């Protein structure tokens, strides 16, 4: 026999005595060593003192897993470990102070999400995401990227959508206090006010322009006439304005960051535009600085705290 540690979270370790004539699977169920599936493997001498991830098979491991990850999905650990074996081999260059990802395995949407997360104020609820985020900001982003893939139900190499990725991650953020109040005005019907909370308070699909949302957008009224919809109140640390990709000018100092999507609905590529002392276009490991930027933009992020309209 040898001594090893089992874990679900790599924080709480459980000392185990393993029979060296039986596989890890027979003693622990599904078992992983640094992302590698060792379920069907017999213990090796050099495994002494090593930490193994295990699928929860008792009340202790199940509570620890839920407290760390905030999911009961029995596939989560397997999907996370499968992703981590790839994301450990990616490169995470510092690009003028932000952790990016060198292009690999169709990861441009994931790199764009990672760059955006470092520029908006967000508190993750699951300790797994809080812990991995801090490592990612320091340049050790493999665990964070593998968690993003697992939470978003994405495989390494799968094409993806930044808006969708941010939406799924926002479900695991403390947006409880985020609030949006909208008004829709029809000259016939009168005025209808809607309040949205949490994730729905920080997302919009149909215009990239925060200023246009504040000024008003024309929408159909079910009476058959056009109504005006405008933002009455916004209480959130940011907003994400999205639209189907279209040519758009990004003006220095008027936004936080943005997603550029080139290509079509079968296959495209993301770049990340950020407003610093000038405009930065981050393309994986590559950085280009320019005084102006026009391209096919699909997401724009703006800083907020509390906005109240002056429209009466």
């Amino acid at each position: 026999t040898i001594k090893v540690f089992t874990t679900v979270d790599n924080i709480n370790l459980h000392t185990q005595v393993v029979d060296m004539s039986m596989t890890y699977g027979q003693q622990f169920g599904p078992t992983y060593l640094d992302g590698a599936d060792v379920t069907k493997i017999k213990p090796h001498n050099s495994h002494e003192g090593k930490t193994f991830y295990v699928l929860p098979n008792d009340d202790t491991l199940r509570v620890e897993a839920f407290e760390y990850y905030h999911t009961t999905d029995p596939s989560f650990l397997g999907r996370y470990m499968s992703a981590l074996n790839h994301t450990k081999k990616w490169k995470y260059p510092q690009v003028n102070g932000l952790t990016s990802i060198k292009w690999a395995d169709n990861n441009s949407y994931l790199a764009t999400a990672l760059l955006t997360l470092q520029q908006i104020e967000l508190k993750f609820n699951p300790p797994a995401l809080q812990d991995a985020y801090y490592r990612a900001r320091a340049g050790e982003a493999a665990n964070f990227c593998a968690l993003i893939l697992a939470y978003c139900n994405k495989t390494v190499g799968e094409l993806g959508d930044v808006r969708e990725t941010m939406s799924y991650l926002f479900q695991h953020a403390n947006l409880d206090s985020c609030k949006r109040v909208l008004n829709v005005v029809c000259k016939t019907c009168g005025q209808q006010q809607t309040t949205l909370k949490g994730v729905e308070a920080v997302m919009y699909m149909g215009t990239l322009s925060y200023e246009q949302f504040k000024k008003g957008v024309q929408i159909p009224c079910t009476c058959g006439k056009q109504a005006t919809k405008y933002l009455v109140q916004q209480e959130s640390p940011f907003v994400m304005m999205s639209a189907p990709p279209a040519q758009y000018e990004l003006k220095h100092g008027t936004f936080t960051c943005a997603s550029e999507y080139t290509g079509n609905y079968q296959c495209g590529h993301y770049k990340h535009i950020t407003s610093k002392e000038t405009l930065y276009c981050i393309n994986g490991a590559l950085l280009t600085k320019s005084s102006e930027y026009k391209g096919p933009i699909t997401d724009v992020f703006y800083k907020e705290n509390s906005y109240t309209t002056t429209i009466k």
Partner: protein
Amino acid sequence: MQIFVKTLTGKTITLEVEPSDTIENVKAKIQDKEGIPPDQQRLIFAGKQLEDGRTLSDYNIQKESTLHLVLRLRGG
């Protein structure tokens, strides 16, 4: 009841639905009209993303309402 769905080309689709229909059920009806696989479809109501597992009732969508159909992006 009937709702309208506006596509990326500006084409308006007319569907027959019930308040208890899930967003998944409305996507199935768009695939009957237009042949678009549900997994590509993203339905938007006045800027708000409608989610799988919710109902048209959950979003207070009424007769003669207009939805917008957009498509998932495929970035690598």
